Symmetry: C4
Subunit: 328 residues, 4 copies
């Protein structure tokens, strides 16, 4: 029942001389889409303040991935893709399960063929309705790679992969601005979830994303060491120039809003308020302004290269197999 | 030795599509009164700041229950009942073991025949005196549903049910303004208390209330998942317009008093003071003003519907069967 | 490896009706002095700010015990004894191992025959030198009851009782103003120390004092439940009118100094400062002023009566038999 | 998986009557250099703010050891050595693995023959490159005692001794101004590291230094109790008159900078800044000014003498043997 904070990685004898030797890119072949990936498998979350086109343009320079948020117009996507043809390779267009979500997704994918990834995202990936929607999307777009979540346990990972998803998004409640655990009491320790779900997915030649709960580069490295193919970040990418969220300067200091997608703040913006039978399951915070995201990416990547050197991993694909966790 | 903070509920595969589909009402048939209940089994605690007639009026609209405090006059009761006849089915009148308390209860029940629940409430329900009192109240009021507590272990749950109580109130020391544990060292972790006492009660076709220790909706869901038939709330319901407690406006902010029923504040108010051989076993806090309780009810119920969807429960009665706790 | 915080007492079926029914006095017959005791076995520590004459005078009225500090003159003792002839029964005169300490102790005992207890107190009761001192004091005063400490393990409890001590003082490092653990790393969790040492002592028909680490009446109740015959209190008794320590009014609030007997404050007062080879093993704090100690005594005794009613103990003597600890 | 905070020492019967009776010196014979040591085996860390010449001069008086930082020039070393001929016996010159570092060290050792210890110090002692370096250094200076680290596990302790190191420096991430754990997730709880590495070292009649994570005298005592031959201190020695770090008087209070050697502050000073592929693995703090280090040394040593009296150790040599740890919540 482990969280990131409960472990450390044991160092091991290595032949690496310098952190600059470490290759942080991965190559994957996806189970169902049959497409191939090559890049640095860290993903900007599809939160409205994080999965922005400005984030994408910077993350592209480092070969990182963006799951674009679901609140841009087709026109905005077309403007982005026209101005940034070389950044469409590691983007996913996102959708929930509504008719309207699906139709807007379609419009994007039809108009911008270079977008080859789909991020299907719900709070509760255990619903049969969600499973059925994944099948539906696989059938409509057989050659796109599908990321689907969220879940925390292997039976659901398997069902979702067998239903047509390529990459399962793992995590219920670990997120920095999530309040699901406080409102519902439901969840799973994130490191344990990653280990269980990685094993399940990899038994089927599928993949996973560790989604949420990382607050330092060491956490990112732990999720990878536990078998995550990709790691998705919200909070660590919030608060930058390139992030969304209002910039607030008060009492001589600068902040940016950062908020859960099921916070009252988000529901006020996009659902016309909070439905009577719902409770909010995210919160709002004000993040001290961090400046340009490039400096944060370099810190994260720098940390992970260090991790690899300490365990003797010359390439990110070696990190999990050379990871021995010490309980602390 | 589990508390609510030590666990999460595991999600499970679900045919539920929306949280709006979840029915939170239960029906119970009581062992000794032979009466039947229908409602949302969340009870406002019989504290003078929580179990108020203003609270009852609002909770009634949501089919929630109020254990009315023991400090209203007979005419206040008569006035309430006259003005709010449809509220009377979801209320209990309360008493401790004092001859004065019981006599005032008898006058209320004589005046208000519509009150069909009795809440017999002492700090130490392990006393043979309390056991005997319960037997006497059963003999006196054969058709009234009797809630009796408090205890934390099965042997006492069984004895209390066999002596004539329908519903056993579980918890010693977990309350937000309780200081019993600090003053006496006595108590029992609440989640374990609920698990153990639920098994003991259910084996005899009786019922329990998890009383105390919930500070968010997820805790309430954990209590129900652990087998509690009802959950009683003090602090979560304190600090509202409908709550008791002085409203205090100071340093630009508003607060409401909230205090334990064995605090010095309560004893000064209703015993004249603290008797020489006694210690206070409650504290006072100032709760930032919360506004109208309807918003808090909606949040709590919304959290629990979300729990139910995550574990596949279409009805609250299915929650405990569908609950697998993960240790955190 | 239990500290007080690690456990709660399980409640049990009781025939107690009222906390007023509980007798907190104990009767002891001491192994080596052959003297008898009757009183409430809580002791004000022999710290210079706690074991004062003003403290004794109040504690006396409750039948509590005072280990008088070792920094009164003989004239001071005679004055107290002359003015308070009925408060001499539950007093001890204190000494360390030095010849000047012994000479002063001897003057007190000779001049004040009503003083029938001796408190032999060193930081490190494991020294053969302390053992031999205990033996010598036993030989010199065969009808005086000897408290001796401090130690935390059974073997040493036994040695000290067999060397002539009646009551063994248990605790190394738990005290509120102690820094031994930070400075040395030496200690033993106090609840486990009490359980182990009480068994060792009782097997020889001797007694122990749980010395240090209580910060609420619940802790005192836990110590007694774990088998301690007496409980000694420093911090809980510091900061009262009757306490020593300078009264400091600053920034409109009142405080009283409270410091370790191994602190730099103490060694400056009574040694020539700190010897080059020693480190201080106590600290200084300013305790917000508590007023009269009577109120604190009532809070402590009331808490312990409540513990006894909860576990079915009519007498403090029964509390440890009736104690079942639950680990939290 | 223990840290210092997870344990206490159990007192035991003794015949000691005063803390002043306790002998805190140790004598060691080193496996590979064959040289001998007599002193109090607490070492000032080779951080630029701790392993200074001012520090060394004071620690000398108490028979404590200094691993000098690697950022003094030859001329500064010669000045020190000419004014303090007797303080040279418990000094180590430090180096990392680069050719420039090796050359600086080689000049110091050639110019000042009285310096008989070498501290080879990298963040990652698990590197084959580091092992080959230790071997090269043992080849070049066969009679110098070599401290080499850092590592946290016994296999690497063994390999480094077999490769020619005498004393292995143990600790990855426990340090007060280290952020390696937050940046990489890598580490090992320090008390357990010490117990494992001390067994591995001692099997081969080598020695270890517990490096990092001590924040009170008790932690020092615990490290010795777990079998560390030496204990190295950064934070506990920062903030003094003798420490490096700028003295900053602000808001009516005095502070001294103390920072990790992998911090942005250090890399700005000694490298070009931070290379694009590196992350900072240390932080900067401002430590309230502590005054003269002598007073801190006396507090540390008095603490450890007290531990020894409580467990019956008349000499520091006895402490580990007489140590029984109790696990604490
Ligand atoms: N990671 C997260 O927590 C995220 C949460 N949201 C939140 O999810 C909810 C639905 O989002 P929307 O975009 O309208 O539709 P989606 O496309 O996200 O599809 C989710 C569907 O699942 C249903 N549902 C069933 N169980 C749950 C549950 N336990 N928690 C949340 N939804 C559940 C919702 O219905 P119903 O609401 O009737 O129960 C909704 O129809 C909103 O409250 C939204 O703010 C949105 C994005 C990410
Ligand atoms: N559930 C919990 O953890 C707690 C609940 N309470 C709440 O606060 C109210 C405060 O009432 P309070 O004045 O404490 O007493 P109660 O209302 O519980 O007292 C009823 C009778 O129990 C007796 N009694 C016996 N043992 C105890 C004991 N250990 N603690 C308290 N009473 C005891 C009292 O006698 P006597 O006073 O002479 O001893 C009295 O005659 C309770 O009625 C309850 O609603 C209070 C504390 C803890
Ligand atoms: N509970 C506590 O921590 C108490 C602390 N004190 C402290 O104990 C020390 C001696 O007090 P004093 O009144 O002179 O003599 P004491 O009669 O209290 O006896 C203590 C004797 O034990 C010796 N000793 C051996 N080991 C230790 C140790 N680990 N810690 C403390 N003393 C030890 C002392 O010699 P030496 O000092 O040379 O080592 C001293 O001669 C002082 O520093 C004093 O402040 C006094 C009473 C109780
Ligand atoms: N003991 C500990 O917990 C730590 C100690 N440090 C202290 O700070 C200094 C840091 O300077 P720095 O250059 O960062 O490290 P080092 O002094 O340890 O560098 C020596 C060589 O090791 C290489 N190296 C390989 N892996 C790593 C790694 N994981 N982390 C750091 N270097 C690695 C470096 O190359 P390249 O830089 O190209 O990768 C460099 O060429 C150390 O010398 C040490 O004093 C720093 C962090 C942790
Ligand atoms: C719960 N979880 C939520 C909410 N909005 C987003 N998220 C989740 O958090 C992840 C990011 O976690 P960080 O710790 O910030 O990196 C997102 O990717 C998503 O899974 C919400 O309102 N409630
Ligand atoms: O003074 C007190 N001491 C201990 N428990 C109390 C006191 N007053 C009320 N309670 C308990 O605390 C419960 C509510 O706890 P909460 O919901 O955590 O605030 C009540 O229903 C009582 O059982
Ligand atoms: O300076 C000291 N160092 C360590 N223990 C001390 C010191 N001075 C007093 N004590 C102990 O602390 C006890 C009181 O502990 P307290 O009740 O937690 O404050 C005393 O009875 C002594 O045993
Ligand atoms: O920047 C850093 N990152 C990691 N460890 C460091 C850094 N700087 C110094 N250290 C280590 O920290 C030790 C001192 O730890 P301290 O005694 O807890 O402050 C040094 O001897 C080094 O091993």
């Amino acid at each position: 029942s482990l969280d990131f904070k409960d472990v450390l990685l044991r160092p091991k004898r290595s032949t690496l001389k310098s952190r600059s030797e470490v290759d942080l890119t991965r190559s994957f072949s996806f189970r169902n889409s049959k497409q191939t990936y090559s890049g640095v498998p860290i993903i900007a979350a599809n939160m409205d303040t994080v999965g922005t086109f400005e984030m994408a343009k910077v993350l592209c320079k480092f070969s990182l991935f963006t799951a674009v948020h679901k609140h841009y117009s087709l026109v905005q996507w077309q403007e982005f893709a026209g101005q940034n043809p070389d950044c469409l390779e590691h983007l996913a267009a996102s959708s929930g399960t509504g008719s309207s979500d699906f139709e807007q997704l379609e419009q994007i994918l039809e108009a911008i063929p270079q977008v080859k990834y789909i991020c299907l995202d719900v709070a509760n990936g255990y619903s049969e309705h969600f499973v059925e929607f994944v099948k539906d999307v696989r059938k409509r777009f057989p050659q796109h790679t599908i990321m689907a979540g969220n879940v925390v346990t292997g039976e659901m990972v398997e069902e979702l992969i067998l239903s047509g998803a390529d990459i399962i998004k793992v995590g219920i409640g670990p997120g920095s601005v999530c309040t699901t655990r406080k409102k519902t009491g439901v969840g799973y320790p994130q490191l344990s979830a990653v280990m269980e779900c990685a094993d399940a997915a990899h038994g089927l030649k599928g993949h996973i994303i560790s989604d949420g709960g990382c607050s330092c580069p060491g956490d990112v490295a732990k999720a990878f060491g536990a078998g995550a193919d990709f790691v998705m970040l919200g909070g660590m990418l919030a608060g930058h120039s390139e992030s969304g969220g209002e910039l607030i300067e008060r009492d001589g200091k600068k902040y940016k809003l950062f908020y859960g997608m099921s916070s009252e703040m988000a529901m006020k913006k996009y659902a016309g308020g909070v439905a009577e039978y719902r409770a909010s399951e995210g919160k709002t915070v004000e993040v001290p302004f961090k400046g340009d995201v490039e400096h944060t990416i370099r810190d994260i990547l720098g940390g992970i290269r260090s991790t690899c050197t300490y365990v003797g991993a010359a390439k990110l694909k070696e990190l999990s197999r050379r990871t021995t966790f010490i309980r602390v």
